[PDB]
């Protein structure tokens, strides 16, 4: 019958975002928290991203993740996806059978050397740009 209307809702929204960042970003290990820091510096950037969706009607996300997938399962999936490409590069290394084009310079073996030092550990998240040189759609056009 009696209720109190509030004019500003940003304080409780920032408090709930800080509580979410406390209950989600604190117990992460180093290999996940590195990627979390690379995505956002803190909860303020996440709130600045999702402030247009937190207010009003909640939108429907196209192709949502499953309810049982956590951050660690996605991290292990991407780590295995990177490790498969690293294994396929380590197996098929030491050969060159493609034709040398006028656009393709002969320094590409140095880029293969840049791909030789890349496969050390799977603790990182960002691959090398020289893999863009190893695309069949870009090598066919060259």
């Amino acid at each position: 019958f009696e209720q109190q209307l509030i004019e500003d809702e940003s304080l409780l929204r920032y408090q709930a975002c800080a509580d979410f960042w406390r209950r989600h970003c604190y117990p992460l290990p180093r290999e996940i928290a590195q990627v979390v820091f690379e995505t956002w510096k803190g909860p303020q950037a996440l709130l600045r991203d999702i402030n247009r969706y937190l207010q009003g009607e909640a939108p429907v996300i196209k192709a949502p993740p499953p309810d049982d997938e956590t951050l660690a399962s996605r991290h292990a999936q991407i780590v295995a996806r990177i490790d498969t490409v690293k294994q396929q590069w380590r197996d098929a290394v030491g050969e060159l059978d493609a034709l040398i084009e006028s656009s393709g310079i002969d320094r590409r073996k140095f880029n293969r050397s840049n791909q030789a030092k890349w496969i050390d550990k799977i603790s990182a998240w960002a691959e090398e740009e020289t893999n863009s040189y190893q695309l069949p759609e870009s090598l066919e056009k060259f």
Binding site: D19, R22, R30, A33, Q34, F37, K41, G42, Q44
Partner: protein
Amino acid sequence: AISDRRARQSHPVLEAFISLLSLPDSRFVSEDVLALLDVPVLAARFDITEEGLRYLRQWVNESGIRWGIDDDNVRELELPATGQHTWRFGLTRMLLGYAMESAQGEWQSVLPYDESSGLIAELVGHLASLLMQLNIWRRGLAQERPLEEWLPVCRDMLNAFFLPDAETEAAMTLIEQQWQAIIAEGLGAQYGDAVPLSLLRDELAQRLDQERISQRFLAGPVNICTLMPMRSIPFKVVCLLGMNDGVYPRQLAPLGFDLMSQKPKRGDRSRRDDDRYLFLEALISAQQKLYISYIGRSIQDNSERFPSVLVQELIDYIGQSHYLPGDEALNCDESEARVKAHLTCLHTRMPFDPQNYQPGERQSYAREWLPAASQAGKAHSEFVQPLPFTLPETVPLETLQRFWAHPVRAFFQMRLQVNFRTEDSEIPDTEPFILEGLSRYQINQQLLNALVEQDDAERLFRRFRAAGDLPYGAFGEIFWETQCQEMQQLADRVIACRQPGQSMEIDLACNGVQITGWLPQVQPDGLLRWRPSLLSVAQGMQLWLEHLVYCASGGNGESRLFLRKDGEWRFPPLAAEQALHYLSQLIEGYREGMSAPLLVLPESGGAWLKTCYDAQNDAMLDDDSTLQKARTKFLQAYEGNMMVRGEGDDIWYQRLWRQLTPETMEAIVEQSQRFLLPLFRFNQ
């Protein structure tokens, strides 16, 4: 005399008791506890004075106390136990600082707090006496109790948290009276089930603000009161305020399930009919003069605000029942509109308007705004005035450094002794997730001073983590790793050309002026300074002054300063004659800056000069493109963007001028060309 107002007797007693009734629901933020300690009753209960509160302000601000009274309170809210940034963490830190110096190190991953060391830390023993009590009732008011158990709760809270005084006796008596009346009205029905705390808290908060005062209704002063029904008293002058639409008549919607509103009878009473009868009784009860004022124009957007329907019907009956003798037979609607416009006095928006003081029908009685409305006053003269100043014999180097760090500030805070003291920053509400500003600069300075001796960076990491200044967990490690990478990249350039040098004395006699001072870390290679800052003109001016005061008495060698991002200020060694000439020029600039305010902006003037200067030919360019790019650099460095604070946003420059005129801009340009020219002339 104002009557019918809400009875407000003691706000800081009733509001503090209401906040103490919301003790388990509170988050125990540091500001809410310093607000509870702001009450003199709660401070006098635990033997805390005002000076003790002023010490506790900075103690809570620097000890890293943000929220959470205990670790069990953090675990109650379904949050992970961080162990830091709590009241218990700050209490342990202050007690370890009372026991152990800060230079010893951590004990239980808690760095001691070196401020509270003497007997003043006894006040800490008062604060730990408070929060523990704030624990006990936090465990007391959570459980639900029946009405037979809520009797001594408010009395025990009053004798525990509050102290009886002469002024606050009636407030505690009213609290006890209302609490016992609520419990007596509850137990009169013999309520057997449990009653929660929030219901009694809301009932006490509603009953405490219900009281009204009407003692001075007819004391003899002019009466200020609301419209009260069934009260019509004849008066000579009756004035009415707030007769606009929406406010009056006061509409109270029915409950909807009331049966009296469905089938009305004769004896039924409604608030709308009561307000209409009040307006009728106010019209009848007026004997001599009736004054009616309503808000017609909005103060925000200048929107037309229509009056109430009663005043509109009154002015309609006035216009349809009376006519002016000026237009005896013109029309019916036009004479009505002329009467309604003659009665309507549209007053001015501001009290200092000259329309109100024009002689005629209405004239203002405010004599304080009469010379303000006459526009016969003198304007604000300029603050710059030629003052007499004699240059003393012995002028130290520290005075010249404080002058050439900021000349307008040295003219303000040293000549006329005017230092604009701004209030300190408030305590933030959350733990620091990022590092930026002064804390990041102090961390980088200590890390650069640690890495210049090849010390253990992990020990300084544990020292900064034990104080809570770093983010929790992995993010603090990432921040410390990137700051250690940046400081190691800077130290690889710093200690590449470092030699052990001692501090030497400076005693110079130039133009009959004695300069006494000391230069620290004077190596045989020259001058070596390092700071974790950006490339700025103020540090270049400081290094140029040190190079002039170093080369004038021996010291053949370069002067080098290393900033971040491969920034370097270098000055070659000069002869004694040029150094003494430039030192005499700086002394003449200092004695000109003490008499008149020397308008030499370092940053914007240096940007204008380095845009106009050419170091290859040692001459200034005069083409239109450089003259436009120098104006662009001056407007960029004076007023910055929305992310970087500009040089013009300062309390020392806004006092002289409010808007940057082009005449003062050209004066600053000329002064920077006169003074800041050897900065970029000998730069390499």
